[PDB]
């Protein structure tokens, strides 16, 4: 089996940010304000998830009910999806779009009709094509108080925001709009409000030399600040419209080639810590549309190669999975600060085989943050995903059963706290859980 | 989470040979000194400045002395800026502030002066500001006094020339126009640190080796001057005194980076009538030390927070260098006194016993004492659990047996903590200050603190230093306030370690020579051993010899003290064996040996023998019991045997508690001989080894005590899983091999081959008669619990599964005893659990077989048939004979035989 990957766009807007800077990013291609037709922002239209968007007019329930009952033509036989949402800043959408957009995405799955965002998801929990999950991408000075809790009415777990750099010149002379001091600080909010924090790396950026973003990288896992669960390397490629391309035309912006390249990324994974995802190494983007930058489409296994004679093995948890059978397994934790609270990572591996079976995370809650009300009355830890691949069964009641015994202890908590998706509510309350807003939690 | 201590320290006076040979001599102050990589030596200058003389002098480790150079110069009052010994073409340089490149040059063999050249090589006009070298040997960058740099090579002819030009940073009333230049830890880049006006400010550019400017800085207020490079490639590690009014009113240290972009600060908890004069890095990284002008401090940093684990103090300090080739040793001059220093790492923690083991550790964040009980809280390196405030700056720490006791020192103070117990440790509680007690009562002021230990948590052993020798002194800790002494005993040699030994009931040291000895309550000096080089961390304990069977093979049982210590390459000792020759980390328990390889594993010895003999060498298909991977470095920390659990630490910052087989069985085995059946079954869920331990490990015990064993596990859904994830091979034979009672110097076995398709056959040529292990137990599962009424009440679904597990696979007794089901709908539920561990139509045969065709029905609606197929055949049977219908039963099957009766 496994997770449905079902990708919606939503409707072609511009950013928030160009009002008081003048202009978007330097290196973001498409929108409104190009020469491609009818594409979101940061995409072309010829991908192949923003050409099933142009043809079902960016109509939420069209979109969504086509990609699924497509992936059970070919016959995946589909029970567990997890929506994500790409294009554009949709948490700057007006707020009567932004509550109908979600509604519709959770009507393809139930077959309620109706249009109250906080009766949908009641319909969607006793759903038996369930969601374990949405992600919604956004930037960081749209994850506040007031955006945070709306993503809880909305089924949101997990949340991507764009980083792409760690210095300050950078993030001024591409008019990304924000700092980075500002950044480090609402990761805080976001994760000990029980989001899946990732973010988003671009490698190649004008001003940042080669040396540079080896440092660059080597900061973003040993200092605390950032230490997230994911990443997306996105190396910067030359399109047509940018603001980038004039650089490259006055011979002003010159890009790697695609031998130091590929040289990096093979240090760039060497230094993954074993709690953190790299999703992708690049993006989908055609090639013929690309002027300079990566010249192919098979960035990922070149850095695996060129890895493989330096004796250097990336201890990535998206690689060291299944996919070579076990046949046994030991429990292991770890142990490490992040962003004002006590992370942990607990985990059934094998240190011989490399490879994982399941992992969990949890947080003591601290005290200069979390603002919800749910968490204020007592001392409470909040766990944070459960994610188990595949008797080889027992693997999640051993994790909720390690996870409890060591708040209570270890801990000194008064309630624990999941942070499930709708469609994934009914695992837990077999387990002794009861929901209460959007966490379901359980007095310790 | 590790701390620093202070390894040896020997001052001299380097006296400069008068002509006379005599006393009172003039001034002869010392200039400046250097190492030598090729010689273990350490050359220094001596001068004058009234009359235009010099002097240089080597001095080797062993008492013996050069004399390499000596001679006038003209140009009389100046004073010297670089100096360096190449050693190979054994020629001496000079530069001084009236622009001269005075050269040297002498002979190896016959060590007498005033055979030696002395040239010029270059003169620069109008003075010289600044200089210094590369760190290869082969550039020079020196500043020119008319605001102008140059750029040499070895062989003095000039390679490039480079004049300077010209909301903005002030500069603040406490600093002088100097100007100073530090190198990339790869050369090819320098930084050349200067004073403009546009308003003052003081700056820096960046150069290549080649006089090319490439960057200048941003305009931050109040460069003090001091100036360095971390030799990684960033982290130029400069000062800002802040002298904005309002909380914002400290002295920090603040970093750069080679484009003069500003990235990073961290607090320098000082005064700001302070002068800082000059900064420090190592040799490669991870220590960063400041030089104030009587006072010298180390930063240490791991999670992006800065540590001070360490503080020197003297009385007037002119400059000080770090080591080239190895590290953590440095050398400066006071008052004319060269004294080299060397430093260490010690993890300060307490006991390992399985009772009283919380096993806690003590780290140094200048003046607090941060403690983590890593058996009650798990807290990471960052943060911390329950630390107590000192007056003090904290050299080193120690803890009592009962780990509620808290010592930590100072200078000219010793400050005792204490907890009144360890579960109202847990309830929030915070160390208390207990007493202050000075430094006047036990000795004089000549002599200073350097370490500290506990025994018994009644005596408190103090490690003392004075100028030429080294003491310990005994104190009296019960009725912890007003403190008394015990005699002040005293050791004819220099102590490099003070640590108890293990279970605190001594204590032991270690001199420079490698002599391990041993002190008892009342000073009673014991030798141990002598390693054949000095170990910077060592452990002692008194082993004991235990045989097999646990008092067998009785004659003379003995005992003998053996000390675990790695030296600084990496050589593990046990009096004199070389155990491993890589090993960078330790720590000893009761029944086992730890340590990590670099080879990145983590490999166990047994301490139950004496006989020590070298390890069998690790290959890469290991897997015996006592080797599992390490990632990049994780090294020790702490050991918790109470939990059976490894705390680790890795480079980048984080905490591992891996949970090692060889201790999770080493319980196991206890509980199972000890007949729990309940602890050892819980460890063998969590854990995940192989459930069959209960069995394979005593064969005889089990079957002889299994009621027991079925009412201990008084759970159904567990019985369930023992029964049926059974293996047919044994356990103890194959993958957990019981390395306890196996010697020293038994070779690592390897794993077995991949059976491959040939020997899949050939493993299952000999089928399995009434002599397999499953057959045995699972009869003697039934043995029990089919005789009591009530057995087969509770535990009547596991019959299904000790029928169904076996090779006979009997399933026409699993479904006679459903068919009596009488009291309600249980049929339904047992006959789904009963064709889920088997195939459907397998069962459904099996069903058809004894004759009940009721009973068939049920087992054929849960097997995804077509209803007009079996249920039309099933009709036909119903309404016949009796005997009618066994013979049309048996047509179907294939039971000729038993269809034609
Ligand atoms: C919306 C996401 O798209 C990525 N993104 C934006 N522009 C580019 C480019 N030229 N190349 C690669 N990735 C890009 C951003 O980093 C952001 O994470
Ligand atoms: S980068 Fe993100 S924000 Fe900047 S323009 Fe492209 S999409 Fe809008």
Redesign the interface.
């Known amino acids: 089996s496994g997770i449905a990957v079902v990708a919606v766009m939503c409707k072609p807007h511009r950013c928030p940010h160009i009002a008081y800077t003048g202009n978007i990013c330097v290196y973001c291609p498409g929108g409104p304000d190009s020469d491609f037709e009818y594409s979101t922002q940061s995409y072309t239209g010829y991908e192949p998830t923003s050409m099933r968007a142009i043809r079902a007019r960016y109509d939420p329930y069209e979109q969504a009910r086509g990609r699924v009952e497509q992936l059970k033509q070919l016959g995946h036989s589909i029970d567990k999806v997890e929506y994500v949402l790409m294009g554009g800043t949709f948490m700057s959408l007006p707020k009567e779009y932004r509550e109908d957009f979600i509604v519709k995405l959770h009507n393809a799955l139930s077959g309620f009709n109706g249009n109250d965002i906080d009766e949908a998801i009641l319909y969607s929990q006793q759903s038996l094509t369930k969601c374990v999950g949405i992600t919604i991408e956004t930037r960081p000075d749209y994850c506040t108080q007031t955006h945070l809790d709306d993503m809880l009415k909305y089924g949101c777990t997990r949340l991507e925001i764009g980083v792409q750099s760690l210095?300050?010149?950078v993030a001024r002379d591409t008019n990304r709009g924000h700092t980075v001091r500002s950044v480090c600080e609402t990761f805080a909010v976001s994760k000990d409000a029980g989001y899946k924090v990732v973010s988003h790396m671009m490698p190649d950026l004008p001003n940042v030399g080669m040396?540079?973003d080896i440092?660059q990288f080597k900061e973003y896992?040993?200092?605390?600040?950032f230490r997230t669960d994911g990443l997306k390397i996105y190396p910067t490629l030359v399109i047509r419209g940018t603001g980038l391309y004039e650089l490259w035309k006055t011979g002003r912006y010159k890009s790697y080639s695609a031998n130091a390249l590929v040289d990096l990324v093979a240090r760039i994974l060497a230094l993954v810590?074993?709690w953190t995802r790299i999703y992708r190494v690049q993006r989908d983007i055609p090639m013929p549309l690309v002027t300079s930058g990566v010249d192919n489409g098979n960035l990922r296994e070149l850095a695996l190669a060129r890895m493989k004679d330096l004796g250097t093995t990336c201890?990535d948890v998206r690689t060291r999975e299944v996919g070579v059978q076990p046949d046994?397994?030991?429990?292991?934790?770890?142990?490490?600060?992040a962003n004002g609270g006590?992370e942990?990572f607990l985990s059934?591996e094998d240190?011989?085989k490399d490879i994982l079976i399941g992992l969990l995370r949890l947080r003591k809650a601290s005290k200069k943050y979390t603002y919800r009300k749910e968490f204020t009355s007592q001392r409470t830890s909040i766990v944070r995903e459960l994610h188990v691949y595949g008797?080889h069964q027992g693997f999640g009641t051993?994790l909720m059963?390690?996870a409890e015994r060591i708040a209570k202890?270890?801990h000194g908590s008064e309630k624990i706290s999941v942070i499930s998706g709708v469609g994934v509510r009914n695992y837990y309350g077999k387990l002794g859980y009861e929901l209460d807003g959007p966490y379901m939690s359980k007095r310790i | 989470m590790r701390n620093l201590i202070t390894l040896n320290k020997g001052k001299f006076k380097p006296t400069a040979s008068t002509a006379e040979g005599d006393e009172d001599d003039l001034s002869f102050t010392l200039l400046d000194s250097v190492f030598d990589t090729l010689s273990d030596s350490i050359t220094c200058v001596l001068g004058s400045t009234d009359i235009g003389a010099i002097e240089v002098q080597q001095f080797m480790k062993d008492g013996s002395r050069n004399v390499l150079a000596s001679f006038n110069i003209q140009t009389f009052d100046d004073k010297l800026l670089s100096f360096v010994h190449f050693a190979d073409i054994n020629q001496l340089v000079f530069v001084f502030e009236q622009g001269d490149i005075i050269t040297a040059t002498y002979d190896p063999v016959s060590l007498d002066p005033a055979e030696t050249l002395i040239e010029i090589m270059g003169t620069i006009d109008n003075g010289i500001a600044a200089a210094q070298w590369s760190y290869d040997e082969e550039t020079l960058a020196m500043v020119t006094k008319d605001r102008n740099v140059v750029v040499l090579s070895k062989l003095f002819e000039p390679i490039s020339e480079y004049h300077l030009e010209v909301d903005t940073g002030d500069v603040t009333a406490l600093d002088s126009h100097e100007i100073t230049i530090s190198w990339r830890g790869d050369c090819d880049y320098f930084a050349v640190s200067s004073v403009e006006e546009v308003i003052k400010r003081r700056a820096f550019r960046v150069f290549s080796r080649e006089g090319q400017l490439d960057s200048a800085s941003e305009p931050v207020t109040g460069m003090e001057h001091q100036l360095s490079w971390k030799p990684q490639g960033s982290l130029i590690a400069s000062i800002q005194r802040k002298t904005d009014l309002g909380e914002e009113d400290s002295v920090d240290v603040i970093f750069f980076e080679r484009n003069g972009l500003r990235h990073g600060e961290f607090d320098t908890r000082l005064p700001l009538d302070e002068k800082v004069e000059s900064v420090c890095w190592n040799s490669n990284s991870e220590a960063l030390a400041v030089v104030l002008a009587n006072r010298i401090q180390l930063w240490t940093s791991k999670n992006y927070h800065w540590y001070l684990k360490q503080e020197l103090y003297a009385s007037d300090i002119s400059y000080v260098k770090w080591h080239p080739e190895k590290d953590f040793t440095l050398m400066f001059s006071d008052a004319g006194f060269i004294n080299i220093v060397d430093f260490a790492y010690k993890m300060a923690q307490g006991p390992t016993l399985e009772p009283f083991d919380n096993g806690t550790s003590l780290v140094v964040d200048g003046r607090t004492v941060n403690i983590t009980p890593l058996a009650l809280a798990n807290v990471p390196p960052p943060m911390y659990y329950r630390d107590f405030e000192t007056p003090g700056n904290v050299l080193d720490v120690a803890c009592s047996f009962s780990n509620e006791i808290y010592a930590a020192i100072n200078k000219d103070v010793l400050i005792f903590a204490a907890v009144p117990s360890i579960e109202e440790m847990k309830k929030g509680k915070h160390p208390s200050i207990v007493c202050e007690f000075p430094k006047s009562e036990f000795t004089s002021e000549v002599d200073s603190l350097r370490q500290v230990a506990f025994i018994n948590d009644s005596i408190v052993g103090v490690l003392l230093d004075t100028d030429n020798l080294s003491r310990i002194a005994l104190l009296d800790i019960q009725d912890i306030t007003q403190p008394t002494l015990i005699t002040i005993v005293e050791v004819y040699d220099k102590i490099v370690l003070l640590r108890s030994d293990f279970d605190y009931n001594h204590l032991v040291y270690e001199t420079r020579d490698g002599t391990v000895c041993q002190l008892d309550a009342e000073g009673q000096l014991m030798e141990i051993t002598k390693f054949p080089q000095l170990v910077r961390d060592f452990r002692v304990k008194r082993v004991h010899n235990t045989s097999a069977e646990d008092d067998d093979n009785w004659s003379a049982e003995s005992s003998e003290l053996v000390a675990f210590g790695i030296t600084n390459n990496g050589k593990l000792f046990a009096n004199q064996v070389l155990l491993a020759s890589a090993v960078t980390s330790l720590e000893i328990t009761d029944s086992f040996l730890l340590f990590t390889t670099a080879q990145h594993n983590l490999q166990f010895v047994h301490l139950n023998s004496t006989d020590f003999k070298p390890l069998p060498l690790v290959e890469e298909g290991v897997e015996d019991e006592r080797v599992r991977a390490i990632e990049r470095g994780s090294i020790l920390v702490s050991v918790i045997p109470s939990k059976s659990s490894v705390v680790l630490q890795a480079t980048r910052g984080n905490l591992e508690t891996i949970y090692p087989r060889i201790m999770v069985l080493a319980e196991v085995r206890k509980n199972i001989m000890a007949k729990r059946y309940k602890e050892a079954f819980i460890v063998c869920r969590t854990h995940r080894i192989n459930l069959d331990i209960l069995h394979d490990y005593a064969p005889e015990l089990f079957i002889e005590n299994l009621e027991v064993f079925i009412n201990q596990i008084g759970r159904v859904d567990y019985l369930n899983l023992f029964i049926s994830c059974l293996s047919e091979d044994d356990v103890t034979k194959t993958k957990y091999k019981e390395t306890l009672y196996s010697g020293i110097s038994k070779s690592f076995g390897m794993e077995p081959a991949p059976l491959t398709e040939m020997q899949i056959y050939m493993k299952k040529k000999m089928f399995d008669p009434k002599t397999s292990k499953v057959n045995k137990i699972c009869d003697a599962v039934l043995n029990v619990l089919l005789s009591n009424p009530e057995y087969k009440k509770k535990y009547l679904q596991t019959i299904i599964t000790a029928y169904a597990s076996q090779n006979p696979q009997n399933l026409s007794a699993a479904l006679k005893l459903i068919s009596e089901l009488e009291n309600s709908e249980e049929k339904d539920s047992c006959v789904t659990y009963l064709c889920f561990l088997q195939d459907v139509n397998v069962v459904y045969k099996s069903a058809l077989s004894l004759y009940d065709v009721s009973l068939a029905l049920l087992v054929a609606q849960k097997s995804q048939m077509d209803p007009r197929e079996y249920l039309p055949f099933l009709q036909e049977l119903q309404d016949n004979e009796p005997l009618r219908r066994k013979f049309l039963i048996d047509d179907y099957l294939g039971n000729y035989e038993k269809a034609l009766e």
């Open positions: 210095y300050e010149d040396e540079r440092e896992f040993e200092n605390p600040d810590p074993p201890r046994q397994v030991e429990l292991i934790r770890r142990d490490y600060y006590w942990t059934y240190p011989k008797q051993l059963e390690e202890e270890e």
